[PDB]
Ligand binder design. Structure first.
Ligand SMILES: O=C(N[C@H]1COC(=O)[C@@H](NC(=O)c2cccc(O)c2O)COC(=O)[C@@H](NC(=O)c2cccc(O)c2O)COC1=O)c1cccc(O)c1O
Ligand SMILES: CCCCC/C=C\C/C=C\C/C=C\C/C=C\CCCC(=O)O
Ligand SMILES: [Ga+3]
Length: 157
């Protein structure tokens, strides 16, 4: 409540560019199109967020809950989904950059994701985005920009 900005962007979050090094995912992120999502505040230490990705091979839409989210200041952690996301940069004015990391048994992973407040991409959104990726010594092929092309979409259900 003390952050009306959240309510402003909450309801629809767009993913239009990512960064990674794991070929399996990087290999595929390069083929998908822009994705959408909806986030809700359950509690500062818990929030509900949904993922919407249009996959021509088979669109996939679902919901997910984030629990025990207060570790490093404001970060989300799902004991079940063994995956956490920390607000690495968010303005909802034109873009937001977040640090996403998935850790499997014996394997750890990190990746950056660039969001857009509007289906369009601001040259600055891609640049600030690249700046961070560079700090991680990333290369173009490691970061793939995604178009607005849409085949499937989610509802305000
Ligand atoms: O390493 C990560 N994925 C793997 C492994 O995850 C998976 O294979 C599946 N996935 C989940 O079950 C999942 C369950 C719970 C939460 C999930 O996000 C799942 O994805 C399906 O996702 C996909 O096929 C693709 N995925 C998106 O397009 C996406 C688009 C926008 C937003 C997405 O989350 C997407 O996954 C590719 O994802 C992958 O290859 C990975 C890391 C860090 C953060 C991630 O989100 C990752 O997914
Ligand atoms: C918003 C989560 C969307 C989840 C589904 C889409 C992509 C999954 C990967 C990263 C998205 C996770 C969080 C979005 C970034 C910052 C949230 C700030 C919330 C706030 O400022 O209070
Ligand atoms: Ga995922």
């Amino acid at each position: 409540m003390t952050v009306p900005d959240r309510s402003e962007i909450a309801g629809k979050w767009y993913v239009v560019a990512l960064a990674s090094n794991t070929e399996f995912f990087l290999r595929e992120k390069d083929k998908m199109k822009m994705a959408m999502a909806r986030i809700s505040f359950l509690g500062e230490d818990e929030l509900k967020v949904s993922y919407a990705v249009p996959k021509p091979n088979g669109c996939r839409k679902w919901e997910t809950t984030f629990k025990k989210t207060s570790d490093d200041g404001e970060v989300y952690y799902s004991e079940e989904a063994k995956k956490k996301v920390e607000v690495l940069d968010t303005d909802y004015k034109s873009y937001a950059v977040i640090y996403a990391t998935r850790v499997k048994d014996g394997r750890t992973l990190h990746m950056m994701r660039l969001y857009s407040r509007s289906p369009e991409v601001s040259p600055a959104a891609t640049a600030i985005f690249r700046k961070l990726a560079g700090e991680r010594n990333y290369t173009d092929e490691m970061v793939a920009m995604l178009p607005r092309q849409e085949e499937c979409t989610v509802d305000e259900v």
